[PDB]
């Protein structure tokens, strides 16, 4: 179950990697990509220069959680619900969020690097 | 639109008349969802118009079961006929708010001029009047609703489980727990009676060692004898006559007092062996298979040392403590007691037949050696 | 009252210093200053 955020969506569109097929190609498994409501609100707030990203994130295959907290700060929402539970993968490309997630333990980390996705703290990728 | 409300409760049925509609589109908003915790803004919404109480706990139990399985009873029919106005069956029926979406069709079958609403608006109006309760009713009911709910919940549970008091093992628990008590108590009080008559003639205590018979004779011998005919309840009468002749021990108010005390010992010892017969009959109609297998009194002490019939039956067949060939027949008897108690507890009305079979088995096994 | 605290001031010392009573037991670290309200009790074994 792979929690996506906004710059993962933008970098996947800028690299032309599909979401579900890129995750299946990276992990060689199945994936439920998940968009929280704060990530979706951040994509909607990013403007109409990102309408492509908005209607690529509104996809039927991408399931969506519903975060219950005031405001739309995706990095604190992702970090809180990932150190809560230790069952997710965080897919991101923020330098700051990548450093937070790779400092907390037991949370794998997917990121668009090159021309397909790379995965960091998962020890069974091959 | 939610014009009337039906709240059923352990004292009776209440129909409320909705004064103001709570907000539909903002029904999840903060102020709308806290106006049903506030009372000064709930009495703006809901007002009581009718409360028909129940006759008693019998009618309350029948109405609770009918309200459970969603059937309109006669008291509910009567109160809805009194309160809800005769609307159309085809154009703008009157509108009742209930809490049960499968009580809905049952109410519309009887009153087809009534639309029954159970969505979240009627649901939280219902939970508003359940939250407030006695304040909304304007002081009109008799009976504490907490005690009503206690009695009704116990009634509903015993009905749904078919709880039997004829097959009630706490009776045999307390029967053997009292029988041991007054056995030791009669032992002490008859020891004191034998003591206070120990200095009238001290050969009665060796001729008659028995406590109850000692008391029953000494409540009519208090002097010298001279017609010692009924001194059996006859060789015992001859021994008592010879000792009463050549007695060798030494008042009046003491004699009256010790006769009252020996009479007390006699009444206690006739309540005992009456209680033996009572727990024998309750053993044959609560645990018949153990009573056939091991005996009624040993079965009583078996379930009282095991705590109850349920704890005895659910104990393992080795952790039953029954009270060489002799030393293995006891283990055999323990597991047969376990099996008979399982039959005995988990059958609804047990029989003597399998305990009789196991008694034949254990007698066959002791004559196997 | 102090008429009871001066009676049981010794086994409260042992409950305070449990970790010295047995070389193989090694309790987890609390201080356990004596509470204001307590009650001495005896364990009932069942039959």
């Amino acid at each position: 179950q792979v929690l996506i955020d906004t710059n993962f969506i933008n970098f996947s569109i800028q690299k032309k990697v599909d979401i579900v097929r890129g995750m299946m190609d990276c992990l060689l498994a199945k994936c439920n990509p998940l968009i929280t409501d704060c990530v979706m609100a951040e994509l909607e707030k990013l403007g109409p220069k990102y309408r492509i990203a908005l209607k690529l994130a509104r996809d039927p295959r991408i399931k969506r959680l519903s975060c219950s907290h005031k405001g739309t700060y995706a990095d604190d929402c992702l970090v809180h619900r990932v150190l809560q539970h230790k069952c997710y993968i965080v897919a991101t490309n923020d330098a700051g969020l990548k450093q937070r997630i790779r400092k907390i333990p037991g949370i794998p980390l997917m990121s668009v690097g090159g021309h397909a996705y790379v995965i960091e703290k998962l020890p069974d990728v091959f | 639109p939610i014009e009337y409300l039906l709240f059923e409760e352990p004292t009776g049925y209440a129909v409320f008349k909705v004064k103001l509609q709570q907000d539909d589109i903002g029904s999840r908003l903060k102020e709308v969802q806290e106006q049903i915790n506030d009372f000064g803004a709930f009495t703006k919404l809901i007002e009581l118009v009718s409360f028909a109480p129940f006759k008693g706990a019998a009618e309350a139990l029948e109405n609770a079961n009918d309200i459970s399985e969603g059937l309109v009873s006669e008291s509910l029919k009567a109160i809805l006929d009194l309160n809800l106005p005769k609307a159309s069956s085809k154009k703008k029926n009157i509108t009742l708010a209930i809490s049960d979406k499968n009580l809905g069709p049952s109410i519309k079958e009887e009153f087809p001029y009534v639309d029954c609403i159970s969505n979240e608006l009627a649901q939280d109006l219902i939970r508003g009047v359940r939250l407030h309760g006695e304040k909304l009713f304007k002081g009109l009911q008799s009976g504490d609703l907490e005690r009503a709910q206690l009695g009704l919940g116990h009634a509903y549970s015993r009905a749904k489980v078919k709880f039997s008091v004829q097959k009630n093992d706490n009776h045999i628990i307390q029967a053997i727990a009292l029988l041991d008590q007054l056995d030791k108590d009669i032992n002490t009080f008859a020891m004191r009676v034998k003591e206070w008559y120990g200095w009238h003639f001290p050969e009665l205590a060796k001729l008659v060692p028995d406590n109850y018979t000692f008391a029953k004779l000494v409540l009519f011998i208090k002097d010298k004898a001279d017609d010692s005919l009924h001194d059996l309840a006859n060789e015992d009468s001859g021994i008592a006559q010879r000792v009463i002749d050549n007695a060798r021990i030494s008042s009046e108010t003491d004699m009256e007092n010790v006769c009252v005390f020996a009479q007390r010992v006699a009444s206690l010892a006739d309540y005992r062996r009456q209680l033996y017969d009572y727990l024998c009959e309750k053993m044959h109609t609560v645990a018949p298979n153990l009573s056939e297998l091991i005996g009624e009194v040993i079965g009583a002490r078996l379930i009282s040392h095991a705590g109850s019939l349920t704890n005895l039956s659910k104990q393992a067949a080795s952790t039953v403590q029954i009270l060489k060939n002799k030393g293995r027949i006891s283990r055999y008897l323990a597991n047969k007691c376990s099996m008979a108690s399982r039959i005995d507890n988990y059958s609804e009305e047990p029989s003597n037949v399998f305990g009789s079979v196991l008694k034949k088995q254990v007698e066959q096994r002791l004559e196997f050696y | 009252d102090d008429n009871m605290r001066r009676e049981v001031q010794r086994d409260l010392l042992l409950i305070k210093h449990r970790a010295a009573l047995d070389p193989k037991r090694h309790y987890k670290k609390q201080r356990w200053e004596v509470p204001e309200r307590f009650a001495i009790g005896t364990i009932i074994e069942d039959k």
Binding site: - | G143, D144, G151, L178, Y271 | -
Partner: protein
Amino acid sequence: ARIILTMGIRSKASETDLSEILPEEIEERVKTAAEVSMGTEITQTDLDNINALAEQIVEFAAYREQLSNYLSARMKAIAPNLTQLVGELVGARLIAHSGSLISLAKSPASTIQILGAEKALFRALKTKHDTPKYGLLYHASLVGQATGKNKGKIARVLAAKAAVSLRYDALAEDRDDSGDIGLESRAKVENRLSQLEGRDLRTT
């Protein structure tokens, strides 16, 4: 026991009422408790053994009262002066503690004061603490009438007067069983108690 001997069943309580038991403020509570109740319904075949147990303990109460009347008559036949002074069963347990009446008669009055509290006495003597002051004489009627530390004071004066009356009881020969010595000693203790209840350590 008397209320279950009268009513038996809850619906039977709903039809009856009763007044020789349970006076005047509790009937309405038992009627509402029978009208709504969480308890089951029992059968007659165990209600009869319940009623037999209930009449057994009503007979037990009557027996206990008869034995106490036996003890009262024996006490004001054996030591009537003590009986006028300290009371029937208090004097009974004093005689019962000390063994014989003459072995109580030959003991000093301070011992008769602390006759019951020996474990407190002897631990407070073997470590130099303060000894008890009431003893078995605490439940006498005069010490019940006194309030404060003058109950220890009149336990002292009551033990003195009870030693007087009791050694006169056990050591007289022409005793008249009339309570004269116990009565003049009890008048002395009563006016002593009155005069040290009339004082008050507050200033006016």
